[PDB]
């Protein structure tokens, strides 16, 4: 055939020449698979001969960041708005909402449910 080398495999698969590769990639391993399996091996810091950490482990960087918030006009506006017609339509939708055992909920709609759900009963109130 052509050869079982990695270069021959790349030439057979028609990869772009000069593209960088992650260490450990082979016929059985893709880049994302190599990253996923290297996640399991992550977590050990880099130390010198005397045991002092010279490079910290992943997500243990010990460096204190600058926690600042920029001035922005987006902070003083309304993120979500709803109209009265849409509110009334949602109230009607909750009114003839019915239950069905063979239908499952996959993603809830982010709605102001306090303005849509019917109020409590008179005796409870």
């Amino acid at each position: 055939g052509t050869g079982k080398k990695e270069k021959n495999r790349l030439l057979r698969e028609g990869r772009t020449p000069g593209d960088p590769h992650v260490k450990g990639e082979n016929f059985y391993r893709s880049a994302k698979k190599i990253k996923t399996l290297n996640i399991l091996k992550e977590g050990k810091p880099i130390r010198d001969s005397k045991g002092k950490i010279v490079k910290a482990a992943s997500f243990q960087s010990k460096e204190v960041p600058k926690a600042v918030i920029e001035p922005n006009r987006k902070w003083f506006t309304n993120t979500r708005v709803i109209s009265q017609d849409t509110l009334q339509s949602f109230r009607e939708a909750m009114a003839e909402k019915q239950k069905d055992p063979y239908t499952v909920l996959l993603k809830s709609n982010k709605l102001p449910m306090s303005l849509i759900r019917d109020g409590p009963k008179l005796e409870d109130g």
Partner: protein, 65 residues
């Protein structure tokens, strides 16, 4: 922020899992990742959904989701 979670039965433990030590908000329809692929652990005891929000002009504090 993160603490190292040790896993394994040997004396030498694997340390890839990180647990969040601060309160977190996970959002609606939250299903946790399985343990084999859960790197960041957000515990159920530190999850909050509501906050006491004060309106500066009206001087009213209301618990809001």
């Amino acid at each position: 922020m993160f603490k190292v979670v040790k896993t394994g039965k040997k004396t030498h433990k694997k340390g890839w899992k990180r647990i969040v030590t601060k309160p977190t908000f996970v959002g609606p329809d939250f299903t946790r990742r399985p343990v084999k692929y859960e790197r960041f652990i957000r515990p159920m005891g530190l999850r909050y959904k509501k906050a006491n929000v004060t309106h500066p002009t009206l001087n009213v504090t209301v618990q809001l989701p």
